[PDB]
Amino acid sequence: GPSCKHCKDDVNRLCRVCACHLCGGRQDPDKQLMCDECDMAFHIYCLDPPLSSVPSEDEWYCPECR
Amino acid sequence: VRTKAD
Ligand SMILES: [Zn+2]
Ligand SMILES: [Zn+2]
Ligand SMILES: [Zn+2]
Ligand SMILES: [Zn+2]
């Protein structure tokens, strides 16, 4: 083999390594921002504070990297 | 920004 050792690519499992790094959820992939440093994914609405839309800038850095 | 959908 799987791409992710932690969930073994099971779409019915939550996974904070290959899905939302905060909640593990796979839903709303168009709202999961990819960090341009660590490449973890983050639901805009799991961030604290939450972002109300997908940012327009080219790059974005998660709370663990900025 | 890149999203998981990309
Ligand atoms: Zn995984
Ligand atoms: Zn989330
Ligand atoms: Zn990051
Ligand atoms: Zn982390």
Author numbering:
A (entry chain A): 299 to 364
B (entry chain B): 1 to 6
Text lifted from the article:
The PHD finger of hUHRF1 (hPHD) has been shown to bind to N-terminal 1ARTK4 residues of histone H313,14. This value is comparable to that for the N-terminal histone H3 peptide (Kd = 1.5 ± 0.1 μM).
Furthermore, the E3 ubiquitin ligase activity of UHRF1 plays an essential role in DNMT1 recruitment to DNA methylation sites, and is enhanced by association with hemi-methylated DNA and H3K9me319,20. PAF15 in a complex with PCNA also undergoes UHRF1-mediated dual mono-ubiquitylation, which is essential for DNMT1 recruitment, and subsequent maintenance of DNA methylation.
